[PDB]
Amino acid sequence: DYLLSANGSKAIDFVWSNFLKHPYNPKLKQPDANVKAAWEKHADWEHWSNMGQDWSLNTPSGLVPRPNHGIAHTLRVAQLVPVIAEFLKAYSGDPKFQKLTQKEIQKAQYMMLFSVIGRENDMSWTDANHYQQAFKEAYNGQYSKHIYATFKENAQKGFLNHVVTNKSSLIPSLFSDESELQYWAEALDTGKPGISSASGILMALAHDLDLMRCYDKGKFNSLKMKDLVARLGGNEDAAKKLADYAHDLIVATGDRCMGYGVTQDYNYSLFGKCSLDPNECLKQLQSIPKPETTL
Incomplete structure (x- = not known):
């Protein structure tokens, strides 16, 4: 509901125009020859080609950059936030x-709009750790700034740039004061915030649910589904209805679904409409009924 508010729509337009519609960073597409060689020594690490994965997607309506972390992904995880919150109040039992x-x-919903704006590639946190260590091995202990640290500062500066000229609209209608705005500026990180509070968990579950778009069923059920079921008081049925909703939002945006329910590849036509126009993407997300807490 708040995504249609004055503050919500403005944040959506900001993150789209300034970050989400722009290509990734060519420098972070792959490691150098030396770091590659050190990376390739670890036959237990995912290949360094993870830095170049999901760079862009060809589509009838145009070339879609960062297809795995674009406007569609951002709007979905935001749409999930208030829905998950109502399921937690009913099924968790946690005060x-x-x-x-x-x-x-x-x-929480508002902050999720800024959750992936700092990304310069599609590599994971576990991939970024691998780069730093492989760099360290290839150059004998030489320091390299962690890529996710760069991601965070990029996201922060973006968030800070937006809120600084809209303080009267955000305070106190959304943020009580500048200090609470300061709390989220420091808490803002790639994917999910570094906090584990009530809001932090809620935002984490939204990010985790939408991961069914790029995770296989085995990885998704093991790494994401279990703690969602565990968060809802071991209610697998309530967790299922929530995952059904996340699934339907993904299908509605023509995105791929790999880890849950009726899986599918990209719907290039539909995915293109949503990925190149936030309002068209929002319209598709509104075509899915909000799940009520009852089974």
Whole structure:
């Protein structure tokens, strides 16, 4: 509901125009020859080609950059936030979800719009660690700045640039004061915030659910589904209805689904409409009914 608010739509337009519609960084497409060789020594690491994975996607309506972390992904994880929050209040039994206010839910949803704007490639945190160590091995202990640290500062500066000229709209209708705005500026990280509070968990589950778009069924059920079921008081049925909703949002945007339910490849036509026009993407997400807490 808040994605249609004045603050929400403005944040959506900002992250799209300034970050999400722009290509990745060519320098971070692959490691150098030396780092590659050190990377290739670890036959237990995923290949260094992870830095170049999901660079862009060809589509009837145009070339879609960062297809795995674009506007479609961003809008979905935001759409999931208030829905998951209502499922947690009903099925968790955990007091800190009960103390979650509507205001905090709106902020959590708002912050997820900035969750992946700092990315310069599609590599994971586990991939970025591999780069740093492989770099260190190839150059005998030489320091290299962690790529996700660069991602965070990029996202921060983007967030700071937006909120600084819209303080009157954000405070106090969304953020109570500048200090609470300061809290989220420091908490903002790639994918999910570094906090483990009520809002932090809520935002983490939204990010985790949408990972069914790029995770195989085996990895998704083991790494993501179990703690979602565990978060809802071991209610696999409630977790299923939530995952069904995340699935339907992905299908609605023509995105690929690999880890849950009726899997599918890209719908290049539909995915292109949504990935190149946030309002068209939002319109598709609105075609899916909000799941009620009852089974």
